Design an enzyme around this catalytic site. Structure first.
Site, mmCIF file in Angstrom:
data_model
loop_
_atom_site.group_PDB
_atom_site.id
_atom_site.type_symbol
_atom_site.label_atom_id
_atom_site.label_comp_id
_atom_site.label_asym_id
_atom_site.label_seq_id
_atom_site.Cartn_x
_atom_site.Cartn_y
_atom_site.Cartn_z
ATOM 1 N N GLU A 184 -8.941 1.787 -0.407
ATOM 2 C CA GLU A 184 -8.343 1.139 -1.560
ATOM 3 C C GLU A 184 -6.830 0.946 -1.394
ATOM 4 O O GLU A 184 -6.051 1.367 -2.253
ATOM 5 C CB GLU A 184 -8.599 1.954 -2.840
ATOM 6 C CG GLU A 184 -10.054 2.077 -3.298
ATOM 7 C CD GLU A 184 -10.745 0.737 -3.481
ATOM 8 O OE1 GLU A 184 -10.071 -0.245 -3.880
ATOM 9 O OE2 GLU A 184 -11.970 0.668 -3.236
ATOM 10 N N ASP A 185 -6.418 0.330 -0.287
ATOM 11 C CA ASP A 185 -5.007 0.045 -0.020
ATOM 12 C C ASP A 185 -4.018 1.166 0.265
ATOM 13 O O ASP A 185 -2.810 0.916 0.267
ATOM 14 C CB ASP A 185 -4.402 -0.797 -1.135
ATOM 15 C CG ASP A 185 -4.951 -2.194 -1.165
ATOM 16 O OD1 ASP A 185 -5.138 -2.787 -0.077
ATOM 17 O OD2 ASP A 185 -5.180 -2.706 -2.283
ATOM 18 N N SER A 186 -4.473 2.394 0.472
ATOM 19 C CA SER A 186 -3.499 3.414 0.800
ATOM 20 C C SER A 186 -3.383 3.411 2.329
ATOM 21 O O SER A 186 -4.197 2.800 3.025
ATOM 22 C CB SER A 186 -3.894 4.790 0.233
ATOM 23 O OG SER A 186 -5.169 5.211 0.656
ATOM 24 N N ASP A 188 -6.475 0.959 -7.805
ATOM 25 C CA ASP A 188 -6.443 0.927 -6.358
ATOM 26 C C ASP A 188 -5.128 1.628 -6.031
ATOM 27 O O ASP A 188 -4.271 1.786 -6.902
ATOM 28 C CB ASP A 188 -6.576 -0.506 -5.804
ATOM 29 C CG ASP A 188 -5.294 -1.294 -5.849
ATOM 30 O OD1 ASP A 188 -4.519 -1.142 -6.825
ATOM 31 O OD2 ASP A 188 -5.075 -2.094 -4.906
ATOM 32 N N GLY A 216 0.854 -1.169 0.000
ATOM 33 C CA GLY A 216 0.000 0.000 0.000
ATOM 34 C C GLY A 216 0.889 1.216 0.000
ATOM 35 O O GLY A 216 2.044 1.105 0.377
#
Ligand SMILES: [Mn+2]
Ligand SMILES: [Zn+2]
Ligand SMILES: [Zn+2]
Ligand SMILES: [Zn+2]
Lengths: 34, 84, 164, 133, 188, 8, 114, 765, 263, 146, 65
Positions: free
Chosen positions: J115-117, H137, E19
């Site tokens: 969303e994955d941040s 994403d 991420g």
């Protein structure tokens, strides 16, 4: 041959991380049924 | 090969592509200091102005719609109904 | 299989029926076996359908197949899109494949993206064949510096001498 | 300037249903065996139990933004405890011979079932709900 | 060159899920625990169910206990260690056994209606950072416009953009042509 | 992952 | 490179005022103040105290985007009551409260052994 | 590729749906040539002074002659007097339309126009709801930003590609953008009955919605404490004039379970707000607002809702830990036994088969049907083990809370974490005997038990055993392998499809043709309609018994019983026995009866819901709220009003105009199905007894349908071919995984027109 | 004295366990934040390196040096370089220190903050003295030298705040709590079987009365009574962090009254 | 009479055993030997990890300061993971680690971590959390046959 | 490389407890858990700071130049 990979048989050793290096030295390859 | 103002079977409505090309064509002229046809009640942005001209049916342009065979119809931005 | 059928009172009711699913195809011959309903027989081999029942039926079956592939993942896609595909594959009376058939075309112009390091050969034939480029593509019009007769360019704009 | 409903109810059941602050009550009417009621109530702020007896008055008075105090000194048009305020999304069911109407208090629902309210209630939003003791 | 964590830099736990930093907050703004402990990193709970990455959850629970007791946590595969066993050890330390903790919002000081799974977990800093791919090539005097991009613009019916974009530099030359033969054999 | 008639 | 200097969180850059007062048109007796180089520390505070005032019809604050240091404060008040004053009031009312608190602390501090 | 930039992307709850955060540093690199005009002589003058190093600035000033003055090196950078006609290449500023796109782009929705919003730190920033149409994403994705270079080009983008104009996509005739992730999870919690907000917080929330009118809504509770409803405040983000009705499993007008959804005049009345209401679903709130209020207003909706919920979610909080994957002590016993039971069923089928008692199912080997049963047994176990775990989880359970809202997570996920992981498998079978007669050297030969052949009893929570682990890796690898394949094979198919259709366009004669001018469809989609204006609607006339049909539509003025009660109508009593009108009412009924026959032929199935243009049910619900129609007083409609009115409307729903007989027939065909829907919605008894429309509301309903209809026709110039190619290819890039050929391999067989299908099957009835 | 009332429980050179009462949660919080982000402090903010043959990097070392807490007792009697009318840094807005270490012995030579030496003129104000609290007056271990390696350095302390960088932060953590008995029902407890049995009872549950079974929900109670505890890092006497906290927050609201005024 | 928390295992109905595994966790290679609780993870996820470990920063060697290699990334403050593996010992991981133990909160906060941040602590960044050295080295010679 | 000066999460000065902590193990034969609490490291953020540190400088110092 050892500088190229002409007998990609020879590669520049990884060194991003210690385990990454260990991993590279223990890596296998299969040229070309399942 | 032209078609009389009568007998046009094409839509009385303006397509979204015609709106976009007319607005873009007019906006370009306005952006090059070409005379404007409405009262800029503040607007300074070409496209924003062009949009005002359209609403006020003051865009002296004609759209030539071609048919697959070559013939074609002519509608004026004035005629065309703008509902989208 | 459960089958939705109108009941004598009018509402749809389920009427389970026995059906045969085969491995292997021979439509023309099985279709003719007594005891079946030749009117409902089917096969995922749209090719065989088109040869026994004709291109129109071939088209329908081809839609039903493309459709099942998309509905297999539960995915939905408005009819017109798959309908358009199936019509193009059918327009010429036969089942024309999509996945690149010709080495030179499928509906282009000796002008669009010079294919092969030997576009010269595409031009050579166009010349010897008296090929007529319609100029409706984006590429052929780029080579010509003009905007394609598509969407926003599917018409011309002109000055109007009416406006007071 | 107004008032629309009045009567006392017999809480015949209080259902919490997976909620922790709200329960759905269904109380019968004293008097007329017809008139009934199903209502949502923030229990945390006005607990309720079976066989209880609530007085239920609708009314519609005493849309401009809302103010907090000042009125708490003045127009205390609240001689009650519980006080909600929803909208009438009333589906005059006109079921059989009885006329049942609906209310929505920002999610808390209410439904009355009688017949003499033909000139009682509104067919419009603005409606308060007052209950005492 | 020294490289300090920034928005856009990639980071990942040891459970196959990376991420990037989306934003950084100063301690003051971060949410916090009664003991005044504040998180170094806040990940989202929506990225948990689907991945089926349960180990990440256990490593955390395990790690908290290890840090609280100064013993190395055994995360070796095929052992008898259990979430149940680990939850007991953590309970002994005075914390709610399943890793949760009451937390307070940093802008208000007010509690959160929800309790937060809070704890240490080993994270790795990955290479290939923002300021290494922020390439912007605007010339006047990926990142390409390929066949697929052109198809999208055609679908949009945006023809003049397509003309403007695909055209090259070559001077707009003015030629003359016969209307009979379409050749450039006109003498003007 | 899941079983037969599903993903591996 | 893209990161702005950290001092820009508490230091007014040029052309910037600490406050920008504006008349809300949506409602009467309402104003919208833009505090520059300030965050939730002063916002929730002046907001919270602005609420204890009964002649205050509306008080809310929000920092639209965590990137920039600045919050907006909307105040609405009963006729005749100027929002500007309510702020002044909400302030003094606060400045006092903190003075008192300060004292009580230095007091209890002494009575401690260590 | 000039005038473009690429970088990592990050989500931003504070940007509007159609904006793109452009790092300031990238904004100084991309320029836009703007001709010097009196409307901008100052702004530009100001920019040139700022120069190539400050933001609102410029890199070059080009004069009449075409001279390029470089602002970074030029002894006159600070001494320039712009003149009308010159062009100033300025930096892209706030609100310039720019094309943002993410590869691979197999969608048009993956190349949309955005409004620039220059910001600090690097990385581009997107609104979270524009995420799905880009399939992006923020775990490292990068995106390209292209800057339109001319005035006509600018317009083309903001009038055609602008994100708002893409909310409702033609690919599946429904929105392709909705509220997701965090906002979805929070919007649910925020809408429960048990959610109340206190005055102090409500004021901030209200203030957060930028289109708020400062009118503090009155509390749902005034009593011991002014308390607001979660539903109340959300309703502020929703604009006026929005109505919406949806009924779930057992939703009543008192929806005990707070099920369904009822919104009236932009105020929710009941029902939790989740994916069925605020997602990218069909009749959903996003679909409705777009159609009723317009693309711009809807685009704003996403931001308004986001801002309210996000704020509320920031102060409520939400999380998930190991706790949520733990099942009741007793449930774990129930689950363990459930499997232990499957190993008995499988053990007995073995003894059976080992005795030679199993009977082969025609066209199957003993061993084939043996396996078949063991796999059915084991799966039933896995499944029932999973439901047991699902049922347990409370409402506190965060995993379950995500599921109930729509955001990430399914049953299968909860089941593998909490209950049994399941049965591994390679090539549709249980783990094969790699070693001679055994899966691993730890077992004995000829061991077909579930433990030997790949069933993983344990959940992820409990952990896998070494054997379970390897087998799960074998299965794992199969997926990785063809994710590689599936990936490749689809990026080539999508290109084969585009290539084949790329030249098909709709012409002004509503015809669909290719570059040669050949007719592919005589009318696009066989109805001239634009896919983005079509909604699934119920063709009522097709279902139910005949008794039901007649009760609903039959109006017999000549029958004291089957007449319009004088209360539904004003002229109700003086119409009884009216012969002339009865002839009108019989034209209508016979027409309804044919329609039903007709429809029963087209949909032999009986299916009633089909995508059609103009949502009539909605137009009516509007009418019934716009004209505050009270269902108590009789209507002032005449039977002639309705029957002739609805008869005239049909002659006005145009797709084709040609004055000849051929085209007129084409026109009657194109509008056939729609008219069937029409006549069944505006049948006299329906209008009067069900809708209760007044002569005024009714006349409005009609002209609206005519407007929406015409607004639903496809416009000539539509690149319908590329549109189709991409509508089929995009989802074909989503097929990852009952014995036939499907997925890509099948789609490829089809597109190839392969004479050697792998699974030639015949279905004979 | 009517109003926000303190009530210290523990107290020492590092912590100030106390109980704020009769105050809006907001104020309890703003004060909490300021102590963390806006209390002025001295900290090395510029390092000139003459010689470094150490095993570390200049930026590496320089980073630690800025993390070494420095005496900031009379910090107000010092100014921010940005306001000081000098060119760069003078004795009116800064404090210069030195660090010279040479690996003389063969055994590993350690370098600590005690080895820092002020070279500017403190003009009477207690400021710049590297803080030391370890049982051997060594202070933070800045580096390690092998025989032969050297480290000649020159730093420059300056007045800064946490918002700008965490090195200027006087606080270390700030325990903060309220309604230890969930009476206001500000949080909803997650549980498997029993809310009460699963969640530990915090310190402050002794300082309060457990609600009573039948008592209905107290819907009018607000949030007063906050159980804090400030922990100083050393650059300032604990008592001060709180004190000066309340102060800076005070001067803030003040800089605002002065805006309306001069507005 | 069996710990319900343990994973379920099968029997030892074997009187034929000829050998016994030294330890089942040895089926793993080097990369996977670094994943904590790989037996509670979904299969493909162990794989993705095995690829990313090779993209983490650590201390590839202790003599890093003496080598002049093309690229290098060193973590300022390498930490040993709180949760380790028995295999991790022979891998010198606690010796030449590649990561830090971040105090991580799983939560929906400002909504800036969807969303994955991730939302990272700016303050922790100041104190050194995750800083790293980056060494790039350029080369160049002189003429040839001329 | 060396004991961080402060605890990443809260700021506690910790760069002064490494030698102590080291002695608390060898010469006093205590355990890391007890050793840490006796150094005043009560909250786990500061604990991990020391318990997890890896003193690689000691290895760098072994290089001649
Ligand atoms: Mn991705
Ligand atoms: Zn000629
Ligand atoms: Zn000075
Ligand atoms: Zn700490």
């Amino acid at each position: 041959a050892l500088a190229t990979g002409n007998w990609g048989v020879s590669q520049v050793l990884n060194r991003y991380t210690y385990s990454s290096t260990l991993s590279h030295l223990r890596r296998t390859n299969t040229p070309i049924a399942k | 090969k032209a078609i009389p103002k009568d007998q046009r079977a094409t839509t009385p409505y303006m397509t979204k592509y015609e709106r976009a090309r007319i607005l873009g064509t007019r906006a370009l002229q306005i952006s090059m200091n070409a005379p404007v046809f409405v009262d800029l009640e503040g607007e300074t942005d070409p496209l924003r102005i062009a949009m005002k001209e359209l609403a006020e049916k003051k865009i002296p342009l004609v759209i030539r719609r071609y048919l697959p065979d070559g013939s074609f119809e002519d509608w004026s931005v004035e005629e065309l109904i703008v509902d989208l | 299989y459960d089958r939705k059928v109108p009941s004598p009172t009018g509402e749809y009711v389920k009427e389970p029926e026995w059906v045969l699913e085969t491995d292997g195809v021979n439509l023309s011959e099985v279709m003719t076996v007594p005891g079946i309903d030749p009117t409902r027989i089917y096969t995922n081999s749209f090719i065989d359908i088109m040869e026994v029942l004709g291109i129109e039926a071939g088209r329908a079956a081809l839609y039903k197949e493309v459709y099942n592939v998309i509905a297999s993942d539960g995915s939905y896609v408005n009819y017109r899109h798959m309908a358009l595909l199936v019509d193009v594959m059918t327009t010429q009376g036969g089942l024309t494949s999509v996945t690149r058939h010709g080495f030179n075309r499928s509906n282009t112009g000796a002008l669009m993206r010079c294919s092969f390091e030997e576009t010269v050969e595409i031009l050579f034939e166009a010349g010897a064949s008296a090929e007529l480029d319609d100029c409706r593509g984006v590429s052929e019009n780029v080579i010509l510096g003009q905007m394609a007769p598509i969407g926003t360019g599917a018409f011309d704009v002109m000055i109007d001498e009416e406006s007071l | 300037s107004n008032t629309l409903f009045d009567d006392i109810f017999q809480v015949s059941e209080v259902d919490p249903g997976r909620y922790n602050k709200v329960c759905r009550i269904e109380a019968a009417s004293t008097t007329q065996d017809q008139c009934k009621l199903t209502l949502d109530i923030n229990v945390e702020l006005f607990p309720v139990a079976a066989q209880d007896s609530l007085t239920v008055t609708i009314a519609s008075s005493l849309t401009r933004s809302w103010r907090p105090p000042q009125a708490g000194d003045r127009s205390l048009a609240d001689d009650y405890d519980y006080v909600m305020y929803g909208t009438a999304y009333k589906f005059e069911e006109v079921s059989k011979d009885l006329i049942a109407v609906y209310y929505s208090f920002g999610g808390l629902l209410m439904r009355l079932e009688g017949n003499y309210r033909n000139l009682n209630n509104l067919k419009q939003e603005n409606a308060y709900l007052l209950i005492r003791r | 060159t020294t490289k300090i964590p920034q928005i856009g830099d990639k980071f990942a736990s040891r459970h196959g899920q990376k991420g990037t930093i989306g934003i950084t907050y100063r301690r003051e703004d971060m949410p916090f625990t009664a003991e005044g402990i504040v998180p170094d990193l806040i990940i989202n709970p929506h990225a948990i169910p689907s991945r089926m990455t349960v180990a990440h959850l256990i490593e955390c629970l395990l790690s908290k206990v290890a840090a609280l007791s100064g013993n190395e946590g055994d995360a070796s595969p095929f052992t008898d260690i259990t979430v149940e066993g680990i939850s007991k050890l953590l309970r002994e330390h005075g914390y709610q056994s399943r890793g949760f903790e009451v937390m307070y919002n940093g802008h208000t000081g007010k509690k959160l209606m929800a309790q937060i799974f809070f704890g240490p977990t080993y994270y790795q800093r990955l290479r290939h950072m923002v300021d290494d791919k922020i390439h912007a090539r605007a010339r006047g005097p990926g990142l390409r416009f390929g066949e697929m991009e052109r198809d999208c613009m055609i679908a949009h019916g945006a023809a003049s953009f397509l003309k403007e974009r695909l055209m090259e530099a070559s001077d707009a030359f003015r030629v003359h042509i016969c209307g009979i033969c379409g050749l450039m054999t006109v003498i003007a | 992952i899941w079983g037969i008639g599903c993903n591996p | 490179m893209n990161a702005p200097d950290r001092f820009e969180l508490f230091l007014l850059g040029e052309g910037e005022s600490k406050l920008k007062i504006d008349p809300d048109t949506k409602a009467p007796n309402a104003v919208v103040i833009t505090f520059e180089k300030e965050d939730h520390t002063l916002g929730n505070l002046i907001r919270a105290e602005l609420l204890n005032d009964r002649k205050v019809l509306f008080a809310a604050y929000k920092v639209e985007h965590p990137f920039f240091a600045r919050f907006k404060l909307r105040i609405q008040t009963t006729e005749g009551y100027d929002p500007k004053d309510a702020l002044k009031n909400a302030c003094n009312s606060i400045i006092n409260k903190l003075g008192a608190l300060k004292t009580n602390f230095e007091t209890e501090w002494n009575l401690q052994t260590l | 590729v000039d005038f473009s930039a690429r970088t990592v992307i990050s989500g931003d709850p504070n940007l509007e749906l159609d904006q793109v955060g452009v790092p300031k540093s990238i904004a100084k690199t991309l320029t836009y040539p703007e001709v010097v005009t009196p409307y901008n002589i100052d702004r530009l003058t100001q920019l040139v002074r700022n120069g190539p190093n400050e933001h609102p600035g410029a890199k070059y000033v080009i004069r009449d002659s075409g001279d390029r003055i470089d602002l970074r090196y030029s002894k006159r950078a600070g001494d320039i007097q712009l003149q009308y006609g010159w062009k100033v290449e300025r930096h892209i500023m706030d609100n310039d339309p720019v094309l943002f796109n993410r590869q691979p782009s197999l969608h048009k929705m993956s190349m949309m126009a955005h409004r620039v919003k220059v910001i600090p730190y690097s990385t581009f920033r997107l609104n979270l709801s524009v995420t799905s149409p880009y399939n992006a994403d923020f775990d490292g994705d990068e995106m390209n930003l292209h800057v339109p270079q001319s005035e006509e080009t600018r317009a083309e983008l903001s009038q055609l590609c602008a994100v708002p104009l893409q909310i409702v996509s033609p690919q599946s005739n429904k929105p392709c953008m909705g509220i997701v992730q965090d906002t979805l999870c929070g919007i649910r919690k925020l809408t429960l009955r048990d959610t109340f907000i206190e005055l102090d917080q409500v004021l901030n929330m209200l203030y957060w919605v930028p289109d708020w009118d400062g009118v503090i809504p009155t509390p749902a509770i005034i009593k011991p404490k002014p308390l607001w409803s979660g539903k109340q405040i959300l309703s502020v983000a929703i604009p006026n004039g929005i109505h919406l009705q949806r009924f779930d499993e057992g939703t009543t007008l008192l929806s005990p379970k707070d099920n369904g959804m009822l919104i009236i005049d932009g105020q929710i009345i009941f029902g939790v707000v989740e994916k069925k209401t605020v997602g990218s679903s069909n009749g959903g709130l996003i679909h409705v607002v777009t159609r009723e209020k317009g693309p711009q207003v809807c685009a704003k909706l996403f931001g308004n809702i986001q801002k309210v919920v996000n704020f509320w979610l920031l102060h409520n909080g939400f999380s998930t830990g190991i706790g949520d994957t733990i099942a009741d002590g007793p449930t774990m016993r129930e689950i363990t036994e459930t499997i232990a039971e499957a190993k008995k069923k499988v053990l007995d089928v073995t003894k059976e088969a080992q005795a030679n008692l199993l009977t082969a199912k025609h066209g199957m080997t003993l061993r084939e049907s043996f396996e078949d049963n063991v796999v059915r047994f084991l799966n039933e176990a896995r499944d029932k083990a999973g439901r047991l775990a699902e049922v347990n989880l409370k409402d506190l359970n965060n995993v379950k809370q995500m599921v109930m809202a729509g955001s990430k997570g399914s049953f299968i996920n909860i089941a593998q974490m909490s209950a049994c992981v399941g049965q591994q498998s390679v090539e549709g079978k249980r783990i094969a005997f790699g070693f001679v007669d055994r899966t691993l050297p730890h077992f004995s030969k000829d061991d077909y038990s579930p433990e030997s052949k790949g069933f993983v009893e344990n959940s992820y929570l409990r952990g896998l055993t070494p054997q379970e682990f390897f087998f799960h890796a074998m299965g794992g690898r199969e997926g990785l392998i063809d994710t590689a394949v599936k990936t490749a094979e689809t990026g080539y198919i999508q290109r084969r499809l585009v290539k084949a259709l790329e030249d098909i366009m709709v012409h002004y004669d509503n015809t669909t043709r290719n570059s040669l001018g050949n007719v592919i469809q005589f009318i696009y989609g066989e109805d001239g309609m634009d896919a983005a204006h079509i909604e699934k609607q119920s063709l009522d006339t097709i279902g139910g018994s005949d008794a039901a049909f007649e009760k609903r539509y039959r109006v017999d003025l000549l029958n004291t019983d089957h007449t319009l009660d004088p209360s539904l109508l004003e002229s109700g009593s003086e119409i009884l026995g009216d012969l002339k009108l009865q002839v009108l009412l019989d034209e209508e009924y016979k027409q309804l009866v044919k329609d039903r026959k007709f429809l029963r032929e087209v949909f032999v199935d009986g299916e009633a819901n089909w995508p059609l243009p103009v949502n009539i049910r909605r137009i009516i619900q509007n009418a019934q709220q716009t004209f505050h129609i009270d269902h108590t007083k009789p209507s002032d409609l005449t039977i002639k009003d309705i029957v002739l009115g609805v008869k005239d409307l049909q002659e006005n729903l145009l797709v084709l105009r040609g004055k000849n007989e051929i085209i007129q027939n084409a026109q009657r065909d194109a509008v056939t199905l729609f008219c069937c829907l029409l006549r069944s919605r505006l049948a006299t008894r329906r209008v009067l007894q069900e809708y209760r429309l007044t002569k005024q509301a009714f006349d409005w309903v009609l002209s609206n349908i005519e407007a929406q209809f015409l607004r639903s026709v496809v416009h000539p110039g539509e690149m319908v071919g590329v549109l189709a190619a991409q509508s089929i290819g995009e989802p074909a890039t989503q097929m990852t995984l009952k014995k036939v050929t499907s997925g890509v391999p099948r789609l490829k067989e089809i597109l190839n027109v392969a004479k050697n299908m792998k699974t030639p099957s015949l279905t004979v009835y | 004295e009517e109003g926000p009332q303190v009530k210290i429980r523990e107290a020492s050179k590092d912590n100030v366990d106390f109980i704020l009462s009769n105050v809006d949660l907001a104020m309890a919080n703003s004060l909490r934040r300021v102590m963390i982000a806006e209390i002025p402090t001295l900290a090395i903010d510029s390092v000139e390196v003459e010689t470094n043959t150490t095993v570390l990097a200049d930026e590496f070392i320089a980073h630690r040096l800025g993390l070494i807490p420095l005496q900031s007792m009379d910090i107000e009697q010092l100014e921010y370089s940005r306001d000081c009318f000098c060119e760069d840094h003078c004795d009116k807005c800064s404090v210069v220190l030195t660090l010279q270490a040479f690996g003389e012995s063969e055994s590993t030579t350690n370098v600590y903050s005690k080895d820092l030496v002020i070279v500017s003129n403190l003009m009477g104000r207690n400021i710049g003295h590297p803080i030391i609290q370890d049982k051997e007056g060594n202070g933070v271990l800045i580096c390690k030298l092998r025989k032969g390696q050297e480290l000649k350095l020159t730093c420059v302390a300056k007045k800064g705040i946490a918002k700008e960088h965490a090195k200027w932060g006087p606080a270390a953590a700030i325990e903060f709590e309220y309604d230890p008995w969930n009476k206001l029902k500000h949080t909803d407890y997650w549980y498997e079987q029993d809310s009460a049995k699963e969640w530990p009872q915090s310190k402050n549950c002794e300082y309060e009365d457990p609600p009573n079974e039948g008592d209905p929900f107290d819907y009018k109670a607000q949030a007063d009574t906050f159980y804090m505890n400030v922990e100083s890092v050393g650059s300032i006497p604990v008592d001060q962090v709180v004190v000066r906290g309340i102060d800076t927050l005070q001067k803030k609201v003040a800089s605002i009254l002065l805006a309306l005024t001069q507005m | 009479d069996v710990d319900p928390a343990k994973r379920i295992r099968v029997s030892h109905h074997a009187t034929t055993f000829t050998h016994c595994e030294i330890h089942p966790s040895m089926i793993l290679g080097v990369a996977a030997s670094i994943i904590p609780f790989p037996d509670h993870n979904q299969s493909p996820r162990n794989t993705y990890q095995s690829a990313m470990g090779k993209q983490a920063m650590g201390v590839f060697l202790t003599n890093y300061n003496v080598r002049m290699d093309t690229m290098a990334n060193i973590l300022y403050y390498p930490q040993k993971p709180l949760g380790t593996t028995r295999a991790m010992e022979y891998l010198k991981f606690r010796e030449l680690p590649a990561g830090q133990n971040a105090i991580v909160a799983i939560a929906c906060y400002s909504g800036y971590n969807q969303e994955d941040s991730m939302i990272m602590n700016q303050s922790s960044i100041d104190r050194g959390l995750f800083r790293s050295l980056f060494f790039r080295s350029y080369m160049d010679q002189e003429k040839k046959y001329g | 490389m060396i004991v961080p000066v402060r605890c990443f999460s809260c700021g506690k000065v910790v760069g002064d407890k490494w030698e102590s902590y080291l002695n608390l193990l060898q010469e006093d034969e205590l355990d890391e858990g007890t050793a840490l609490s006796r150094l005043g490291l009560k909250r786990y953020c500061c604990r991990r700071m020391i318990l997890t540190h890896v003193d690689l400088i000691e290895k760098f110092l072994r290089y001649n130049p």
